[PDB]
Amino acid sequence: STHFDVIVVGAGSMGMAAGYQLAKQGVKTLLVDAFDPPHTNGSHHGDTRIIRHAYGEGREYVPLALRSQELWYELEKETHHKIFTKTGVLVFGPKGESAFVAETMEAAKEHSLTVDLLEGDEINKRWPGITVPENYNAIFEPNSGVLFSENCIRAYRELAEARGAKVLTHTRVEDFDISPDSVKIETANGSYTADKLIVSMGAWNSKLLSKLNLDIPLQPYRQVVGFFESDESKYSNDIDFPGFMVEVPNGIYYGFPSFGGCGLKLGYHTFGQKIDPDTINREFGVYPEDESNLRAFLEEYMPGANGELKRGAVCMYTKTLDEHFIIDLHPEHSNVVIAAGFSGHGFKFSSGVGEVLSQLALTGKTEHDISIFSINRPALKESLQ
Template identity: 25%
Template structure:
């Protein structure tokens, strides 16, 4: 019913000022919250605002660290990403990262994937990353779980590891609280207002003033930044994730079996038993017939499979060029993270970079390729070169 002038209005109270406010306390947001609170404590207050529960990675979710070795921008951050995780483990006493090594396998009979190994080798050489080129015989000698056809080319990266994202999120949140950070859950942010001297953060019932704000709100980032920055052109990517209760646990444990990406007629990415007591097989793209997964595993990695525990479609809204955004807007007062779903191994480092940008206005890490105003995100959509969905990587 319309109550005219007597209609009830929303009253928002202006809360105390904060030096830093983090909007969105998922994986990257909780990492930023920790690194900010560590850098700022005890001289500046840090507040995290999350529309749901803080640190919201699904239990059992595992991601590879520094597996996207075919891209210069990611390879340049491989070492710092490992260091960030080691530092978090050191101060928390928690084991988050397990070294497995990683393989990229190129099927010689598929012209579309030729050059994959050469690209990985070239990127590794430019960034001083330890790699080893193998043939099919070397693959079987090192990991007899595989059954190559013969003629495959393989890149082995010993430094690749896997991280338990659910445990990592909880650890970042706990460490942030230990450094004095305050976290308000179920407090969605509706808008930011930049006054030129500070940023107002508007929630349903309060307005917070901050010197610097970090926005890592996932799919809600553009809505939060309305009026502060132009929307980031986005596309939706999908990945089918299947978990198997393999009966061969010892053969597919992290100490015996690596992360792998097999590039052939289809692209398959596999992870050893970790988090859940199950192996994980991922395939980019729309939902596919189960028979394709089963045929690949039966032919190439026969012991990997077992009773199927679950199959789900992982959906992510990412920048149009499928690379993350790590940058600042509003004259440096607002840090932005977007599209980091595809690079979960960089989570802790991304949080540290955002904290450095907020505290110092700069970072020593090379992030120019992740700028919010890079050409791929500012050209008209017709000028952005499409990236084949099947060629994308999840790190």
């Protein structure tokens, strides 16, 4: 017999951030999660996440990235958990052959972002450990960096709970009952009601949004990352080796410097197995591509980091057709907010998104420009059942 002002289903990257924003405003909030965030069954583990500002995916992304960066700095000051390290972010690729690099450079110029432009041997000289052909160019963002994603969610949860937010763990929501003036969720642990609902189930959005009369193409992908023993005199954060996201002939790869000798971490961004969040195999190495795809990149571009595999993780991306997020009110219910399809690049924005979700839930509007994330946009191919 407990009503809430707002109920958040899926207390992960986006949901926990939202819960923190709501709780900080004295809003009676209930956060429900299938597991106990942060955990390793969703899209937020792997310890680290990159945050860049020269977002060429769309201008709207820049302001959100900068607001998120400020929010991350605020979180750092509010918790004892480590939140962010300014490793800087390096983006490189073949000159004139990378839409990603060109887009990044354009975004930097258009928003007057502080960056360094270098090419060929200059890259190899500035960062020993990196070996790119002379026809490669790059753009470096010194003020971007690395977020400790699990710590972010953990910190937001501890802060939210301390302010009154209730967190119901290991409880999978199975259905929704929406009315013009209230929302109700159904779980094996019971039913709950509220005035507003926020839906942010990550990979599971592709399976449960249908329970909200929504038919939106969402494809979950199995994405692995690996930690490799590396030459610490070159790849350590201590010697300023940067975080990175680059485009080479066979795709986009991202990486992180070795922290406290944990080893350089690498991931293959443009490829992943299409899976279902309930049947995905979370063991690293069951597919030969898991490790081989990573080493193929390292031996060519960062040979000193192609050492023994120290650790592996299996995580998920949830892609929309245009790879842009979905942040909007349910088209048939203004009291329901949807956060889905972050397509492999949403964590850096989670702090900002939590703020947006909080505003949408409480006012039906947000001060941020979220037009490109509309649930009604054509390229999404969204429809009602």
